[PDB]
DNA sequence: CTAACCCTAACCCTAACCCTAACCCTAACCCTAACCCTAACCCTAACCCTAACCCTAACCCTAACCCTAACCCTAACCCTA
DNA sequence: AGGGTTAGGGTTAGGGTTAGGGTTAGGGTTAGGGTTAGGGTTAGGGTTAGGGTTAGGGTTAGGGTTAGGGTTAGGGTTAGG
């Protein structure tokens, strides 16, 4: 059966070519070596905050499933209104 | 333009032009799906994430990363430079008012 | 009849107008129905926040050899408390200055400046 | 003609009482009292607005203690939110008991 | 009688220098005063336009500190003390 | 022939400390009132402002200028410099999101 | 679903009619339709909140065309706000002339 | 397949009467209510500091099992030599 | 009706004497094993501890807690008090050199 | 660290005082060399809040109010 | 009248297996940027003091806020198409 | 059914006015030290590749979970004193 769970091979999930392609899409020609760790840390902090907000919303809604509507509500409460996914 | 060696700095411009005309996701879903589940474990266990929540999360994260990279690139050329550095991301985040 | 009229503040143990909070929640066009424990909860939260802020201001005034609370001491305590600064980030206190924070580069380390004549 | 001037509502007596409860030797100027009055009103309007948004999102036309506890945990940070939640729970427990 | 050209110059150079010293600036360039005056004029124009709109909506002809605080909070700058 | 002239730096530092350890205002009141009156003249004529209104306006303007000067000084320090520059002010306004 | 379920609300028909009026022989996508619906809902909620705040500040209880026009002039920029105000005044005049 | 409780004893076991039994061994008569959390915290940090050295000692011999000998060897470095169990 | 309730003090004293005149343990074994397993999970995965190892760990932890409680009680007695306090624990850890 | 301390103290040479200052400033260095005392070196001017003048209000009696 | 109760219909979330194939990791070579040193200028640091000017201390009064008195139209709730 | 509208007078209040002297800025002056120009050093990743870990569907099942509908009762509402 499934006798395993998730580990810390998760910060390393944000691979280096992915961050490089994101910087190239933004407009960066040369990317330093110590940028990947800081980017992963900032992304982890942001995801932690958004997931905490979504968990609070789900606990207030008396539910156990996080929905895209709750995610959009949390993102708008922070100050980032997202369109398309939801309504 | 021999296929053995290309001038460094020229292939990056073509890559930038090619990647700036597409709307596909750069971060992959399966590595990003486990990061969302691993963070939600500290708050409350036995949680079921919808198929549309991870997509919006990835889209928002990609947009935020693109904005931060653009801000860092704008801060890089200020000091007569062309490359980004970790000492620039801190200032770019502090001026925006996120780190406080 | 009616025996006696006890105050809601005395029955709740708080020092905030629960009746005024309920009236503001009913006339503020927030919802058609206003609960009973919600005004008490809000009054308790506001009282705790006010008590913490007043304690910080009194500590700052006692450290500044003063007896009264001034907006300068209020701003100093707000900027000192990390949670208060994160809560009230977009709030500017009138008649109050910032903290005397001098960077290390701005400090005077000319080191004879050099570049001039050979002082060897 | 008639007197009957409008009365402006303020929380000056409650702030002074909290001051005497915490530090019974200090004072509060008029500017500090006005700052504390604007801080209490701004937080009260932010929490009431967050509770109204939660009552409008979930199809329910009421505001109970859970809506305020959720608005407190979403607005206040960490230790302050937990302390405020504990104080509110103690208050509602003393109300439901006495 | 008031010279509309003698109002940007009202923000004197020593005033801007003292403001930069209070913020934490050691050396102030020469071309900073004009840009600071322009930015301050744009911000004051926006805030005064918001206050004028609020006063016209209130069917009044006097701009009040309450309306100024309301406009400042609508823009994203909550000010305490002056008002309530 | 020695008035003991101060080297450029100590006077600026002590002035910064003296202005930081105070709560009084810096800009005058009557010129600011004339300025806001001239600005309000471009919208509705025959307007009467308020003393508390112009005082709050001056306070908010002084706070915004202090924040902008702090951001510019931080950008200059990051750029291996000690003086502010219009390019630094422009970059600060571009990162903060005021450019429009 | 169709098992005594509930029906949501949207503005797809109005958006499609506006698109057909401003430009014939064009098309649209579901993502664009959802984005337009979210934008319309966000602007609607913002203008409604601004009008409610203005009515509460004016010590009144009715949000009318004047409050809506003030909220529009405060939210929208310059020429867009002017054109929106002109269109709203024309619509109000048409409603007053014929109902 | 896997335990539904992934808390893995979040600093549990150190209950109120358990601390109320160790403090009375020393001579504490009145035990404050704000002492249980600090006791759990200091116990957690001590166990962390000891387990770090234990894992560092066990990882040297390419071994995946922690024995009592490595535990007492790591405890000797901290300044607390235990007799009997190790040997 | 009567149960002859003991005044606060004699029960604590007799419990102190009974627990001092014994050699058995106080903390349980399975919760401590789960705790040390959770702590070891943060370093190397798939770890197998030992019964004697966790027993020695529990014994050393109990001895350290007893010493800390003795130091805290001594500090409280010196401070004209009879109950322990977190400030007393902090001062004991500061003097002993354990810091944080 | 010693050179940074000397440059901050308007000095060119490294002295044991600057060495002790840098050691006490660096948390990892202080944790590594905890039982090491540097000769010809003082501690940091750390004054507690209770030792500062006022706050305690030394008026005591104050005949009046 | 709306929220706390119960049965329960159906949905949507998770568990698990495949088939490679776009993508990810390292190590192989090398070009040009980040960075330290240094030196030339001209820019703003530091007065400065006599003139600009502002806020101090009051008077007023006439345009403006709105208060409470009268009155009716606009807004809501009802039902039912 | 009462909130908003109208006319009416009170009533605070801000603009307009005086003068002056004490605070402070305006424009020109001496000169220090920081700035961006330069050239030399170094290693920092840019670019290619080929071994190969792992991801997007493709297509299943099961049983948690939201809540649709119905019942009912009690807390918020409204009113006056």
Nearest to F95 among B79, B87, B96 (CB): B96
Instruction: Check residues 18 to 37 of chain B and report those whose beta carbon is under 7 Å from nucleic acid strand K.
Output: 28
Instruction: Give the CA A16 to C1' K26 distance in Å.
Output: 13
Query: Which letter, b or e, does each residue of H14-42 get, where b requires 16 or more Cβ atoms within 10 Å of its Cβ?
Result: beeebbbbbbbbbbbbebbeebbebbbeb
E26, E27, E33, E34: CA torsion to nearest 10: -140
CATH 3.30.420.40 fits E1-84, yes or no: no
Q: Is the CB of F12 under 7 A from strand K?
A: yes
Backbone Cα Rg of chain H: 16
State whether residue C89 sits within 8 Å of chain B by CB: yes
Query: Which letter, b or e, does each residue of H48-60 get, where b requires 16 or more Cβ atoms within 10 Å of its Cβ?
Result: eebbebbbebbee
Token pair, residue H75, equals 């405890």
Chain B residues near residue A72 by CB distance under 8 angstroms: 56
CA angle (F75 as vertex; F73, F78 as ends), nearest 5: 110
Name I43's Cβ contacts closer than 8 Å, sequence gap at least 6. H51, H52, H55
Q: How far is H32 from chain I (nearest CA, A)?
A: 6
Question: Which of these, C24, A63, G6, C36, lies nearest to D58 by C-alpha position?
Answer: A63
Token pair, residue B22, equals 């597409």
Q: Is the CB of B82 under 7 A from strand L?
A: no
Cβ–Cβ below 8 Å for E84 and D41:
yes
Residue with tokens 């009145």: H30
In three-state secondary structure terms, H5 is coil
Question: Which of these, A43, A33, A51, lies nearest to A13 by C-alpha position?
Answer: A43
By residue range, what is the domain housing residue C9?
A: 1-107
Chain C residues near residue J55 by CB distance under 8 angstroms: 62-63, 65
Name I44's Cβ contacts closer than 8 Å, sequence gap at least 6. H55, H59, H64
- Cα–Cα distance between A5 and B41 in angstroms, integer? 11
In three-state secondary structure terms, J11 is coil
E42, E44, E46, E48: CA torsion to nearest 10: -150
Nucleotides of L under 7 A from a protein CB: 3-4, 10-11, 14-15, 24-26, 32-37, 44-49, 54-56, 64-69, 75-78
- Cα–Cα distance between I58 and I64 in angstroms, integer? 10
Token pair, residue D46, equals 């932010």
Name C12's Cβ contacts closer than 8 Å, sequence gap at least 6. C18, C40, C43, D91, D94, D95
Question: Which of these, B56, D66, C38, D77, lies nearest to A52 by C-alpha position?
Answer: D77
State the DSSP H helix or E strand holding residue C68, giving kind and residue range, or none if neither.
strand C68-69
Residue C39 contacts residue C25 (beta carbons within 8 Å): yes
Cβ–Cβ below 8 Å for C49 and D43:
yes
Q: Which chains touch J (3 or more CB pairs under 8 A)?
A: C
Resolution rounded to one decimal, in angstroms: 8.0
CA angle (I32 as vertex; I28, I36 as ends), nearest 5: 170
- Cα–Cα distance between E14 and F9 in angstroms, integer? 17
State whether residue A53 sits within 8 Å of chain D by CB: yes
Token pair, residue A44, equals 């982890």
Which stretches of chain C sit within 8 Å of chain G by CB?
28-29
Q: Which chains touch E (3 or more CB pairs under 8 A)?
A: C, D, F, G
Three-class HEC string of D69-88? HHHHHHHCCCHHHHHHHHHH
Q: Is the CB of G29 under 7 A from strand K?
A: no
For residue B9, which nucleotide's C1' is closest to its Cα? L46
Q: Report the interhelical angle of H68-78 vs I51-78 (nearest 10°).
A: 30
- Cα–Cα distance between G19 and G14 in angstroms, integer? 9
Residue with tokens 């006692």: C62
Residue C33 lies in a domain: yes
State whether residue A79 sits within 8 Å of chain G by CB: no
State whether residue E84 sits within 8 Å of chain C by CB: no
Sign of CA dihedral A60, A66, A70, A76: positive
Residue with tokens 């900027």: C79
- Cα–Cα distance between B80 and F5 in angstroms, integer? 36
Number of domains within chain C:
1
State the DSSP H helix or E strand holding residue H75, giving kind and residue range, or none if neither.
helix H68-78
The CATH number of F16-99 is: 1.10.20.10
In three-state secondary structure terms, J20 is helix
Q: Where are the domains of chain A?
A: 4-87
Q: Where are the domains of chain B?
A: 16-99
Could you report how far apart the first and last alpha carbons of chain D are, in Å? 49
Distances (CA, A) of C27 to C32, C36, C37, G56: 9, 15, 17, 10
Q: Considering only residues 4 to 33 of chain A, which have any Cβ-Cβ distance to chain H shorter than 8 Å?
A: 4-5
HSE, side-chain direction, 13 A CA sphere, residue F32: 22
Question: CA D59: distance to chain centroid?
Answer: 26
Q: How many residues does chain D have?
A: 98
In three-state secondary structure terms, J1 is coil
Q: What is the residue-wise DSSP string for H6-48?
A: TT--SS-S--HHHHHHHHHHHT-SB--GGGHHHHHHHHHHHHH
Residue E59 contacts residue D14 (beta carbons within 8 Å): no
Cβ–Cβ below 8 Å for A83 and G41:
no
Residue C36 contacts residue C8 (beta carbons within 8 Å): no
In three-state secondary structure terms, G25 is coil
Cβ-based contacts under 8 A for chains A and D: 13
Helices (H), C64-96: 71-80, 82-87
- Cα–Cα distance between F9 and C109 in angstroms, integer? 10
Q: How far is D88 from chain A (nearest CA, A)?
A: 17
Question: Which of these, F51, C79, E82, C20, lies nearest to D37 by C-alpha position?
Answer: E82
Chain D residues near residue A77 by CB distance under 8 angstroms: 74
Backbone Cα Rg of chain C: 25
Chain E residues near residue C102 by CB distance under 8 angstroms: 24
The CATH number of H4-87 is: 1.10.20.10
Token pair, residue C73, equals 């001491």
Task: Tell me the pairing of strands A65-66 and B48-49.
Answer: parallel
Residue with tokens 């320090």: F77
Chain D residues near residue C74 by CB distance under 8 angstroms: 32, 35
Instruction: Check residues 39 to 68 of chain D and report those whose beta carbon is under 7 Å from nucleic acid strand K.
Output: 60-62, 64
Cβ–Cβ below 8 Å for D9 and C31:
no
I68, I71, I73, I74: CA torsion to nearest 10: 180
Cβ-based contacts under 8 A for chains A and B: 157
Chain E residues near residue D12 by CB distance under 8 angstroms: none
Name J60's Cβ contacts closer than 8 Å, sequence gap at least 6. none
For residue F8, which nucleotide's C1' is closest to its Cα? K45
- Cα–Cα distance between G94 and A4 in angstroms, integer? 69
Chain E residues near residue F96 by CB distance under 8 angstroms: none
- Cα–Cα distance between H18 and C93 in angstroms, integer? 50
What percentage of chain F's residues is helix, strand, coil (to nearest 5)? Answer: 60, 0, 35
Q: What are the backbone angles phi and psi of residue D77, rounded to the nearest 5°?
A: -75, -115
Three-class HEC string of chain B? CCCCCCCCCCHHHHHHHHHCCCCCCCCCHHHHHHHHHHHHHHHCCCCEECCCHHHHHHHHHHHHHHHHHHHHHHHHHHHCCCECCHHHHHHHHHHHCCCC
For residue D63, which nucleotide's C1' is closest to its Cα? L76
CA angle (B33 as vertex; B29, B36 as ends), nearest 5: 140
Nucleotides of K under 7 A from a protein CB: 2-4, 9-16, 23-26, 30-35, 39-40, 43-48, 53-55, 63-69, 74-75
Residue with tokens 């402002």: F49
Chain G residue closest to E70 (CA)?
G57
HSE, side-chain direction, 13 A CA sphere, residue B86: 10
Chain D residues near residue A73 by CB distance under 8 angstroms: 57
Q: How far is G32 from chain E (nearest CA, A)?
A: 30
CATH topology of domain D12-97: Histone, subunit A (1.10.20)
- Cα–Cα distance between F80 and F93 in angstroms, integer? 20
State the DSSP H helix or E strand holding residue F19, giving kind and residue range, or none if neither.
helix F10-20
Q: Where are any strands of DSSP class E within chain G? A: none
Q: What are the backbone angles phi and psi of residue I85, rounded to the nearest 5°?
A: -145, 150
State whether residue E69 sits within 8 Å of chain F by CB: yes
Q: How many residues does chain G have?
A: 99
Tell which of D21, D45, D51 to mutate to test the C interface (max C CBs under 10 Å). Answer: D51
Cβ–Cβ below 8 Å for C85 and B97:
no
Token pair, residue H66, equals 């922690």
Helices (H), chain D: 12-22, 30-57, 65-75, 79-97
Question: CA J42: distance to chain centroid?
Answer: 8
- Cα–Cα distance between H35 and H24 in angstroms, integer? 13
Q: Considering only residues 13 to 52 of chain G, which have any Cβ-Cβ distance to chain C shorter than 8 Å?
A: 52
Q: Where are the domains of chain G?
A: 12-97
Name J46's Cβ contacts closer than 8 Å, sequence gap at least 6. none
Instruction: Give the CA A64 to C1' K13 distance in Å.
Output: 11
Q: Is the CB of A40 under 7 A from strand L?
A: no
Query: Which letter, b or e, does each residue of J25-40 get, where b requires 16 or more Cβ atoms within 10 Å of its Cβ?
Result: eeeeeeeeeeeeeeee
Chain B residue closest to H10 (CA)?
B42
Q: Is the CB of C8 under 7 A from strand L?
A: no
Q: Is the CB of A20 under 7 A from strand L?
A: yes
Residue with tokens 């001039």: C116
- Cα–Cα distance between G84 and G76 in angstroms, integer? 9
Q: What is the DSSP letter of I80?
A: T
State whether residue H2 sits within 8 Å of chain A by CB: yes
Question: Which of these, C92, E40, E56, lies nearest to F56 by C-alpha position?
Answer: C92
Question: Which of these, B54, B52, B51, lies nearest to B62 by C-alpha position?
Answer: B54
- Cα–Cα distance between J54 and J65 in angstroms, integer? 18
């Amino acid at each position: 059966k499934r006798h395993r769970k998730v580990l810390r091979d998760n910060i390393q999930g944000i691979t280096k070519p992915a961050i490089r392609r994101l910087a190239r899409r933004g407009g960066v020609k040369r990317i330093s070596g110590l940028i990947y760790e800081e980017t992963r840390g900032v992304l982890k902090v942001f995801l932690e905050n958004v997931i905490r907000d979504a968990v609070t919303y789900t606990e207030h809604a008396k539910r156990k499933t996080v929905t895209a509507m709750d995610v959009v509500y949390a993102l708008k409460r922070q100050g980032r209104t997202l369109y398309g996914f939801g309504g | 333009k021999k296929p053995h060696r290309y001038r460094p700095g020229t292939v990056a411009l073509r890559e930038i032009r090619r990647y700036q005309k597409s709307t596909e996701l750069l971060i992959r879903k399966l590595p990003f799906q486990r990061l969302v589940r691993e963070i939600a474990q500290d708050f409350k266990t036995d949680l079921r994430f919808q198929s549309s929540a991870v997509m919006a999360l990835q889209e928002a994260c990609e947009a935020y990363l693109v904005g931060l990279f653009e801000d860092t690139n704008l801060c890089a050329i200020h000091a007569k430079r062309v490359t980004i550095m970790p000492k620039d991301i801190q200032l770019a985040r502090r001026i925006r008012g996120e780190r406080a | 009849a009616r025996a006696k009229a006890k105050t809601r503040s005395s029955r709740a143990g708080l020092q905030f107008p629960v009746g005024r909070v309920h009236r503001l929640l009913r006339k503020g066009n927030y919802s058609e129905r206003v609960g009973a424990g919600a005004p008490v909860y809000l009054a308790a939260v506001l009282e705790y926040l006010t008590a913490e802020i007043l304690e910080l201001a009194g500590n700052a005034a006692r450290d500044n050899k003063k007896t009264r609370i001034i907006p300068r001491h209020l701003q100093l305590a707000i900027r000192n408390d990390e949670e208060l600064n994160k809560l009230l980030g977009r709030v500017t206190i009138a008649q109050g200055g910032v903290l005397p924070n001098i960077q290390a580069v701005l400090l005077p380390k000319k080191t004879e400046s050099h570049h001039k004549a050979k002082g060897k | 003609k008639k007197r009957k001037r409008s009365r402006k509502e303020s929380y000056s007596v409650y702030v002074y009482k909290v001051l005497k409860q915490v530090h019974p030797d200090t004072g509060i100027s008029s500017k500090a009292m006005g700052i504390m009055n604007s801080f209490v009103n701004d937080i009260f309007e932010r929490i009431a607005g967050e509770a109204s948004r939660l009552a409008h999102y979930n199809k329910r036309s009421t505001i109970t203690s859970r809506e305020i506890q959720t608005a407190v945990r979403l607005l206040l940070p960490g230790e302050l939110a937990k302390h405020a939640v504990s104080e509110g729970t103690k208050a509602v427990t003393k109300y439901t008991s006495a």
